[PDB]
């Protein structure tokens, strides 16, 4: 059964990642995290 090698990965549709604005790095990212959680988890739409 060596014929079916990479059967799925060679047939999935091709999609491209979107372009998004960059995020702050270093201590400028931790403040972004602290701003959301404290001083008002991943919920998905139904």
């Amino acid at each position: 059964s060596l014929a079916r090698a990479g059967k799925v990965k060679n047939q999935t549709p091709k999609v491209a990642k979107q372009e998004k604005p960059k995020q702050p790095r270093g201590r400028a990212l931790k403040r972004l995290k602290y701003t959301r959680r404290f001083l008002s988890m991943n919920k998905q739409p139904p």
């Binding site: 059964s1 060596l2 990479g6 990965k9």
Partner: protein, 142 residues
């Protein structure tokens, strides 16, 4: 009850511990020079070999699948082992008479997962990492 408690009985306690220490499978393997003699790698962490054939090993029940494996011959000691090609569709990077780098699977001799009797894994082919080619971060030489 099961011990000697004399004040001048240190010789008996020393011999009791020395003899009973051989019942440890882990301790005896470390202290026996016959260890690493049956180990194909010879005690090292990695080894290089030449790919000679491609095989397909069935999965143990209750799992049904064909695991893509490769038979290689080591260079340092000229032994024969069976290795595993992990990622999806990665069999096309490996050809016969190719130099590869082989490492362990993670349990130090024991088999891993539903693959029966396989304890090695392919991590590099033709001097370039297998996962690097899988992510297309590099290209196959020649």
């Amino acid at each position: 009850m099961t011990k000697t408690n004399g004040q001048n009985a240190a010789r008996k306690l020393v011999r009791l511990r020395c003899r009973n220490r051989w019942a440890d499978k882990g301790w005896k393997r470390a202290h026996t020079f016959s260890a690493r003699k049956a180990n194909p790698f010879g005690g090292s962490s990695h080894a290089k070999g030449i790919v000679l054939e491609k095989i397909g090993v069935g999965a143990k029940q209750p799992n049904s699948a064909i695991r893509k494996c490769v038979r290689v011959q080591l260079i340092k000691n000229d032994k024969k082992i069976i290795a595993f090609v992990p990622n999806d569709g990665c069999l096309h990077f490996i050809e016969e008479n190719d130099e590869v780098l082989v490492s362990g699977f993670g349990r130090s001799g024991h088999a891993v997962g539903d693959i029966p009797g396989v304890r090695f894994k392919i991590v590099k082919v033709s001097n370039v990492g297998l996962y690097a080619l899988y992510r297309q971060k590099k290209e196959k030489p020649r």
